Amino acid sequence: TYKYVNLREPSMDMKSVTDRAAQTLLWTELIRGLGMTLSYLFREPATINYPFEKGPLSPRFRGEHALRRYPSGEERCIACKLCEAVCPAQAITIEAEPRADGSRRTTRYDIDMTKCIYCGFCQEACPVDAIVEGPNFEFSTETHEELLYNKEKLLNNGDKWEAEIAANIQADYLYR
Amino acid sequence: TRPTVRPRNDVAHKQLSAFGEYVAEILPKYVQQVQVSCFNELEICIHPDGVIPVLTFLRDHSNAQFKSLADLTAVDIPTRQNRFEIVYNLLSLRFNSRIRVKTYTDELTPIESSVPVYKAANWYEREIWDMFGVFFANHPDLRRILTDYGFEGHPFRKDFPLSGYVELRYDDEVKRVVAEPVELAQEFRKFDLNSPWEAFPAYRQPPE
Amino acid sequence: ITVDEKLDITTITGVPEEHIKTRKARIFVPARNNMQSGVNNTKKWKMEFDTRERWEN
Amino acid sequence: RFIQWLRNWASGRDLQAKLQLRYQEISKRTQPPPKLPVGPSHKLSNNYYCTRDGRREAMPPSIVMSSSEKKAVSPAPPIKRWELSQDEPY
Amino acid sequence: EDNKQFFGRHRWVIYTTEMNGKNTFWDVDGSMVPPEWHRWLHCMT
Amino acid sequence: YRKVRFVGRQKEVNENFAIDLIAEQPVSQVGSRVISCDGGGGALGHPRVYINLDKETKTGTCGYCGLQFRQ
Amino acid sequence: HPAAHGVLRLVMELSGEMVRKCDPHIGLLHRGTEKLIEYKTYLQALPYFDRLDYVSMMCNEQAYSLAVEKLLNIQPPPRAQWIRVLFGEITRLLNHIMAVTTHALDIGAMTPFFWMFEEREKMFEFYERVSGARMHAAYVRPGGVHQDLPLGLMDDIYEFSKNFSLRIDELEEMLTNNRIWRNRTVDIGIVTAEDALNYGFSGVMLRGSGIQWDLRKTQPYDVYDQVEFDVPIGSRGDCYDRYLCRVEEMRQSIRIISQCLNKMPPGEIKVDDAKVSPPKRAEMKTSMESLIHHFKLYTEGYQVPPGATYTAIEAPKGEFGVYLVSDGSSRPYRCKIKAPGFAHLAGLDKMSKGHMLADVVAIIGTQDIVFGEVDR
Amino acid sequence: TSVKPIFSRDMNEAKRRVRELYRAWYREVPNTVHLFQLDISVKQGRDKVREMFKKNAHITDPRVVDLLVIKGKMELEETIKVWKQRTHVMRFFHETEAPRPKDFLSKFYVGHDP
Amino acid sequence: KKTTGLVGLAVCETPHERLKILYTKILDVLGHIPKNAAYRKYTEQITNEKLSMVKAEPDVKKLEERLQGGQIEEVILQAENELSLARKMIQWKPWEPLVEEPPASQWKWPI
Ligand code: SF4
Numbered sequence A: 001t002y003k004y005v006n007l008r009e010p011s012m013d014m015k016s017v018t019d020r021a022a023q024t025l026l027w028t029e030l031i032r033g034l035g036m037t038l039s040y041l042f043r044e045p046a047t048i049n050y051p052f053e054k055g056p057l058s059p060r061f062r063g064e065h066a067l068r069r070y071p072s073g074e075e076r077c078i079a080c081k082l083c084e085a086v087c088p089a090q091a092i093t094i095e096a097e098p099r100a101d102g103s104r105r106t107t108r109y110d111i112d113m114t115k116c117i118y119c120g121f122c123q124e125a126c127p128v129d130a131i132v133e134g135p136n137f138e139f140s141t142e143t144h145e146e147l148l149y150n151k152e153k154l155l156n157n158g159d160k161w162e163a164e165i166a167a168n169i170q171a172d173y174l175y176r
Numbered sequence B: 001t002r003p004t005v006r007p008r009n010d011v012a013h014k015q016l017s018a019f020g021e022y023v024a025e026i027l028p029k030y031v032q033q034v035q036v037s038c039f040n041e042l043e044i045c046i047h048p049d050g051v052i053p054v055l056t057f058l059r060d061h062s063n064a065q066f067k068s069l070a071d072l073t074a075v076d077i078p079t080r081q082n083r084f085e086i087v088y089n090l091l092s093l094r095f096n097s098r099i100r101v102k103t104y105t106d107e108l109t110p111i112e113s114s115v116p117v118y119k120a121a122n123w124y125e126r127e128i129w130d131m132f133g134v135f136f137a138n139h140p141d142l143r144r145i146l147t148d149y150g151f152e153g154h155p156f157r158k159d160f161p162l163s164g165y166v167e168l169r170y171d172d173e174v175k176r177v178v179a180e181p182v183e184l185a186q187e188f189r190k191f192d193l194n195s196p197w198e199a200f201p202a203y204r205q206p207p208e
Numbered sequence C: 001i002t003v004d005e006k007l008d009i010t011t012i013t014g015v016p017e018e019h020i021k022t023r024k025a026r027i028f029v030p031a032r033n034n035m036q037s038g039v040n041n042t043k044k045w046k047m048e049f050d051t052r053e054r055w056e057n
Numbered sequence D: 001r002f003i004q005w006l007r008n009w010a011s012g013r014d015l016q017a018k019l020q021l022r023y024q025e026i027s028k029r030t031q032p033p034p035k036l037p038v039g040p041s042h043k044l045s046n047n048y049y050c051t052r053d054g055r056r057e058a059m060p061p062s063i064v065m066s067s068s069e070k071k072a073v074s075p076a077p078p079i080k081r082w083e084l085s086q087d088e089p090y
Numbered sequence E: 001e002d003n004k005q006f007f008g009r010h011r012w013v014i015y016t017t018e019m020n021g022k023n024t025f026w027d028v029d030g031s032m033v034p035p036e037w038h039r040w041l042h043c044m045t
Numbered sequence F: 001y002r003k004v005r006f007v008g009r010q011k012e013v014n015e016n017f018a019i020d021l022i023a024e025q026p027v028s029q030v031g032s033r034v035i036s037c038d039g040g041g042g043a044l045g046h047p048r049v050y051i052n053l054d055k056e057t058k059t060g061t062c063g064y065c066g067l068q069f070r071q
Numbered sequence G: 001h002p003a004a005h006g007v008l009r010l011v012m013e014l015s016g017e018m019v020r021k022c023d024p025h026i027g028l029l030h031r032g033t034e035k036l037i038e039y040k041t042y043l044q045a046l047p048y049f050d051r052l053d054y055v056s057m058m059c060n061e062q063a064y065s066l067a068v069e070k071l072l073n074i075q076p077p078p079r080a081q082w083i084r085v086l087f088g089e090i091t092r093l094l095n096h097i098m099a100v101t102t103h104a105l106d107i108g109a110m111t112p113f114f115w116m117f118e119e120r121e122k123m124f125e126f127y128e129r130v131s132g133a134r135m136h137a138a139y140v141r142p143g144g145v146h147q148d149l150p151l152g153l154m155d156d157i158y159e160f161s162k163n164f165s166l167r168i169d170e171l172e173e174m175l176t177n178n179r180i181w182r183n184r185t186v187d188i189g190i191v192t193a194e195d196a197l198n199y200g201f202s203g204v205m206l207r208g209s210g211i212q213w214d215l216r217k218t219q220p221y222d223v224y225d226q227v228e229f230d231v232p233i234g235s236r237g238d239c240y241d242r243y244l245c246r247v248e249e250m251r252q253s254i255r256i257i258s259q260c261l262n263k264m265p266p267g268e269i270k271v272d273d274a275k276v277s278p279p280k281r282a283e284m285k286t287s288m289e290s291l292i293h294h295f296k297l298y299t300e301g302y303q304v305p306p307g308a309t310y311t312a313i314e315a316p317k318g319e320f321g322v323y324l325v326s327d328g329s330s331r332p333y334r335c336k337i338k339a340p341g342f343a344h345l346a347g348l349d350k351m352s353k354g355h356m357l358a359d360v361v362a363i364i365g366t367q368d369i370v371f372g373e374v375d376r
Numbered sequence H: 001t002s003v004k005p006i007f008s009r010d011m012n013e014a015k016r017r018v019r020e021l022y023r024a025w026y027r028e029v030p031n032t033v034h035l036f037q038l039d040i041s042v043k044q045g046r047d048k049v050r051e052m053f054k055k056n057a058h059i060t061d062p063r064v065v066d067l068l069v070i071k072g073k074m075e076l077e078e079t080i081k082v083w084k085q086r087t088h089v090m091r092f093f094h095e096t097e098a099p100r101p102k103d104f105l106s107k108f109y110v111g112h113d114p
Numbered sequence I: 001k002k003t004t005g006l007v008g009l010a011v012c013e014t015p016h017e018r019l020k021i022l023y024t025k026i027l028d029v030l031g032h033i034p035k036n037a038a039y040r041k042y043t044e045q046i047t048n049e050k051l052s053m054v055k056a057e058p059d060v061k062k063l064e065e066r067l068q069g070g071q072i073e074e075v076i077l078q079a080e081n082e083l084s085l086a087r088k089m090i091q092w093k094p095w096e097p098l099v100e101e102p103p104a105s106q107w108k109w110p111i
């Protein structure tokens, strides 16, 4: 359909034009709002007082990585070379080679933490359900020699909290 | 078939057969092919001669308005023996339709600017000179947009290896920011996705 | 109209650098990976160049 | 009190819609286990691929190309105008 | 934890001293919370 | 030659190792022919795969799972 | 400082006072996109559409995911779309909270920024609870929405919406009829011509200028047809009647979010046919057929038939294109994106000749030019 | 080959052209060399210009010799103005880059198989 | 009417004879083209049928329907330019037969 805005005409009669000459010359407008709508300061401030208080999130949040393990640990990753092949940024790097018993596992697993674009494509391709984006924003170290991760940085970083992780998926896994 | 498959509509496909039937009728000096995309859009294959001419007919008429120029672009195909391609794309405000105009070329053969017909091909023609290398003559201005001042390669064509030929890095030995050949920290792995068996019978290339 | 016929074998120069004369390209029909029987990966004549050293970082 | 209506002396009055929602009237958590249904021809004994067919559809249908009482057919009918759409259209 | 009279500043925390090989007090960062409360203090649940 | 990079940096390496941590498992038995190996709990673990133990004494732990398994 | 969260360098030859000339240099953010999307598959290459602009997130990808479902002859299931209206029409509350403010931070005020972004936060949760991440979130796909939303959000959308029309009444008493602002903008940068069409401009700096057309109700999207709204229009072609659309266009949205919470029917989410959608994690993990379509679907992509398309949407600042050729196999061929910024800034040099220099800072802000998008 | 040429016709008006803009370069090297506040021997600036124009010497054709120009005609826009900041210019004369051997036996001890 | 509507225009003035100048002006000039190419067979056929509706009814308002332009004042600028092509149309020569078919295999899409 339509509408027409800013289409109006002044009335042009001496009952009006005072009302527009009691405005220009006496400032009866322009004190209407910012004499007032500004104050209106008397509302409670809104601030999350940071070092202590913190704000909301959701169980589907994305962040620092992990590699779980079952009960008594198997290093849940089977090195099926997938979370590697859907990765848009191509951070992941994986090198398998048959472990002594003959069950296969990894050797090098490196997520670069600069390239990773935080998809949620590597949480959703792993069929054996290993690699999982953690919910902790612990980060920010002082040397780029660092953020590159090896395998045996990840596991700890994913065994430091599994009380966080193992209780999110069981909220979220019923939807997908 | 209905539930998950996009329901078609015929009416739109009858008219854009007609209205495009006869623009091969009244400008046969130029137009060399026309067809109807199964989604109800048209593609007019036009010799490189008419570009300013044909649009000008499409520029005004009472049976075809096509005042709004939306998208100029290009495609570059090797093994087409005339490399590049243009595709003009025009919306006719009264009649609610899209009709695209394809015109081939090469690098060396110039093409003539559309700028007096529409004033919105002013930028879209400056760009293409940077990327693919097509050279538009009689253009009020020709310069360098989207690219740095150093790229002598005209990237988006198919011969530019993705990472360009010179990485950049700053060194304090003097006071400039200078350019040393490209040295990566990872190969840019090349995966290989193209699976056999030809899942599409309808598009089956000629038997040969 | 300025049709001006002539014949000069088309060549183009200056856009790449030294990789004009150093290398030798190759034009070949891909051979069908043999672990599977699908015959549709044939049918287009591609080209691909010589391979130079990849080292270790 | 003396500061309560001095917040109400300007901007009309609100006291119901208030910027910070900080007080109650929110949603609590996800308490219930949900169950997401799968409807759309998910069953057996009938659903048969090759009737559901999303893809495999033809090449763009051609029209006369190289090698009559026309009314000056336009691509479609011209547009009829709009209303003025009573809301407070001025 | 407050009386449920606020949203987002209703749930808060207190740091005290020298958690693990740590400077005493006026150093407080916020990566210290035990890896349980991320299921509480962040209002994820 | 390479070894001068982690000097003073203490060299993170993996205290535990799974190279074999497996063999400590009480390798199970069933009393039947073929079994269901879905591990680590339902719908978290390897895809279900059925293995045959009939040899004499061996089993087969499917190779996703690793956990020593037999009759 | 006046980069509007971007890095342009413009050069003007002014005549002693009046500008009368401008000729900007864009191309500071190019990054090399459309050369890099011939090299990635269809579902792998999605985000590089989300990272194009910084502000509208789910409104991009609504314009890609609609340019693929076509070539596939497939529609989402009903509960798909009625999401894509609730998020699709909730981010029109983002670019209209920004382009009234971070425009008017140039005019010099403070609070209409520090007063609002208290609130533009309360929205960013709702990207985080639904899927993952702070801003860029890859959620829409070729098959409709990724995964269902938690138990919740419908008491956090409702509870939040009925508070909001007040906030937008603290950007009104603080702006409209405040004189020092009215005088900074009226009859400034007026393009009323039929060049304002001839250039092919998109929505606002159209609809606020008279000529009356919009791509939401002249074309359907994804069920957009079944909800009622009115498209505000302007009087004279200056800026302060391109502002006044962007208030009366934030007071239309709260009609639709309020109209769209009542209708969402239960149903699946992904497209059903499963060649184009992955299966769940209950199904890929037991039966057989549910790998070979989950394990060939995460290496090569769909198979999407050859032939070219085009498409368009109404993005908060104007249209958005995708002209998507496809060669008949898994990786695409040209994917050519057009967003405004080849129009709304093609027309600065024209528009501003004959006003001062201290206007040209406040002309730009009305087009809503935001860069890295001119990666077009 | 039948396609319209760009500016030239055959080789003469063409090789009048390359002679021409030479001077626009030759007359203006140095006004920049004081303008960017870059320091070099001004004769270097007249060696490079003459080092480049002698480079592409084997060109057999019009519409090539016109193509190169359209590049060369441009640069005088940027350089005679200031659209470059010192570091788009000096990149012509490569200061930092260690030499290439280009001889034989100097290769054979460094680098595999060029 | 005082508002030209679609802005950039202005109402001046005469309806009902301002068109009739131009169609008639179109019809005469248009005839100078050879009669083979259908261009006349169309470009004219729309004008006559158009003009039949012009003559004659009030108000200008009900001249709007059955003649689909924009507002009348715009329909002129619809009829204004359709000339400015015609009087070029003899410069370059569409009617003549086709020139330079492409090199016989070009438009075939899947390479
Ligand atoms: S997690 Fe899934 S993807 Fe990542 S390695 Fe183990 S198996 Fe392959």
Ligand code: SF4
Pocket (backbone or CB within 6 Å): A086, A087, A088, A089, A090, A091, A092, A115, A116, A117, A118, A119, A120, A121, A122, A123
């Ligand atoms: S996180 Fe995002 S980016 Fe890093 S790997 Fe998984 S998907 Fe690729």
